[PDB]
């Protein structure tokens, strides 16, 4: 029961629970699955300071999110009883939507039932209508955890605004702090931890965590991200993180100055 898979059917049912776990479990871990990147931007060059951002915007306005994984914990790294993770699965049609070949083959190998997604997936904008008035976003007190997640939050903003991402890197962080006042990107906090480097799974193997659930899927990646966060905090940061030094610095992005895309 540890990870509750959520479809267009049982979305509201589990939303009812989530509006009650967020009262007792305010720390939220997240990772996203999406059709990769399909386009390089434009007339910008790899020399512009904010190129990583425009590269993010190009492929986020263009593509749709596939999976969202949310794990709920508290200040001391404990999970709520029963389901601690929800794996939201969105509506994605292969016949009609874009993607990179390799990313879809990888997601299929991991265990994505693209046909079941096609018939029974959640629509993104109604999930936005719900997550809005839930307390998970926009409300002070919640602290978001993530990993190498410029694109993850890019898609979250794309969905919550029902609009294309703003044209400059500055406005994006503006609206982003509004929806997510507190963010800890583990990939950026690692920039102060000697002898930690690598993707999510490599770091997970270094920290002696046990991966619960299917690899490369959003829910299990988020649960493992939370394990990594609370295992690393007690280890390197002495069980506390300076807000001024690490809050909101998305890895690869200009905040906290090196690619922003969660490369394999």
């Amino acid at each position: 029961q540890r990870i509750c898979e959520v479809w267009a059917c049982n979305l509201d049912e589990e939303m009812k629970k989530i509006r009650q776990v967020i009262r007792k479990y305010n720390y939220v871990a997240m990772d996203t699955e999406f059709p990769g990147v399909v386009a390089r931007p434009i007339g910008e060059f790899r020399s512009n300071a904010d190129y990583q951002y425009q590269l993010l915007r190009c492929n986020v306005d263009l593509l749709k999110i596939i999976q969202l994984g949310l794990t709920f914990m508290n200040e001391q790294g404990e999970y709520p009883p029963g389901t601690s993770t929800w794996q939201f699965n969105f509506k994605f049609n292969l016949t009609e939507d874009m993607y990179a070949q390799d990313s879809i083959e990888l997601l299929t190998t991991s265990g994505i039932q693209f046909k079941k997604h096609e018939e029974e997936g959640i629509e993104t904008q109604y999930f936005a209508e719900l997550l809005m008035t839930s307390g998970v976003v926009l409300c002070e007190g919640v602290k978001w955890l993530s990993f190498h997640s410029g694109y993850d939050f890019g898609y979250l903003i794309k969905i919550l605004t029902n609009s294309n991402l703003p044209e400059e890197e500055l406005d994006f962080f503006e609206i982003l702090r509004l929806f997510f006042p507190v963010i800890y990107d583990v990939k950026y906090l690692m920039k102060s931890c000697k002898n930690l480097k690598g993707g999510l799974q490599e770091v997970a193997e270094q920290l002696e965590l046990e991966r619960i659930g299917p690899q490369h899927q959003a829910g299990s990646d988020s649960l493992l991200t939370g394990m990594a966060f609370f295992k690393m905090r007690e280890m390197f940061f002495e069980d506390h993180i300076d807000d001024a030094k690490y809050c909101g610095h998305l890895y690869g992005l200009g905040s906290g100055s090196g690619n922003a895309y969660e490369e394999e």
């Binding site: 109604y126 936005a128 809005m132 008035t133 839930s134 307390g135 969905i159 029902n162």
Partner: protein, 229 residues
Amino acid sequence: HMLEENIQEKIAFIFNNLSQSNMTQKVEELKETVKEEFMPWVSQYLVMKRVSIEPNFHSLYSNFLDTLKNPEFNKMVLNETYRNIKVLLTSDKAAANFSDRSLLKNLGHWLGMITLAKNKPILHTDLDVKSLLLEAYVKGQQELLYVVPFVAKVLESSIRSVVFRPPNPWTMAIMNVLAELHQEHDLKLNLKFEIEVLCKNLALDINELKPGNLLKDKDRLKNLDEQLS
């Protein structure tokens, strides 16, 4: 009546005379006359005795909270607003209760300014707007005249917030419910007017909206969580 007369008029004098320039003064005047435990009753005083009747000074009553910079108090204010609105929504309604409806409209406006305008949501555990609209539809024209001008005053604040500004999916969802309402033939004329005015207030075309078919569900309308009496 909620406080000793000596404790009542004291917090009354703070809010009696208020303006832009004397803002900082009256804030400090509140902070060193009023014990930090009467803050629930100063919250009750502001919501019940001041905000509920005086929409004009709402702006000022916001700046004060912005000047006071006290979060626990803002939370008490939010809860008091929610409670008063709950009282009006479950009261015995009548075609003569204009006082109660006017109070509800102003309380709505206030709620829109303290939540949406501040980039803060109206929690589904605190209040369900869409469900309130659908329930008002099934319960008759009276509940509609109670609810619609109230939801209008909450959504008018969505424009000054970069978040809930159009095309925000939740804002647009409530707008789609209101547009699905605007198309009925027997909807009261002033409510159609109220809706059109809201559309103008949020810089939207009432025709480019995307009405749903929520009102023909019948089955779903029979299974709404009752927020009204």
